[PDB]
Design a protein around this ligand. Sequence first.
Ligand SMILES: Nc1ncnc2c1ncn2[C@@H]1O[C@H](COP(=O)(O)OP(=O)(O)O)[C@@H](O)[C@H]1O
Ligand SMILES: [Ca+2]
Length: 147
Amino acid sequence: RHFYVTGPVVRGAGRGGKELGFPTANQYFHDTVALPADGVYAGWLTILPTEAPVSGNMEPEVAYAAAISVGTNQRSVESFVLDRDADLYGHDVKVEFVDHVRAMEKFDSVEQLLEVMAKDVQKTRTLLAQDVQAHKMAPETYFLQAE
Ligand SMILES: Nc1ncnc2c1ncn2[C@@H]1O[C@H](COP(=O)(O)OP(=O)(O)O)[C@@H](O)[C@H]1O
Ligand SMILES: [Ca+2]
């Protein structure tokens, strides 16, 4: 299908995310793990098969639409799962990269950063819908809202 990485969702600085309305599931990787260049990507986040209870509105083995930010400190992957809310900490998750949204950019203010994040989300919805429409998949296996 798509390029992907897996690993546990871990603690970041725990500020600048949830309290601004854009919580992101942090994963970290040694830079010898293949990843795309720093930037924002449209993709799917799946909680891998597990006996662990998940708290909130995501179930294991379902691909949730995500806006994924890749950074370099060693490498980081930070996924905002669209229109969902669950405690992902400690869960083993797969992040699939579908399409490129934009290169890394710098921002004037917190407010400008949030404006761009909202644009990244809207572009993520459209790119994923275009990838759902071609390459047809079963309704039960993915989650994506148009609005
Ligand atoms: N829609 C969502 N997308 C990503 N993570 C979410 C979402 N809703 C709740 N979470 C939880 O919020 C956490 C991220 O919040 P954040 O404020 O970015 O803190 P941190 O710095 O620890 O990454 C995730 O690890 C996950 O447990
Ligand atoms: Ca985060």
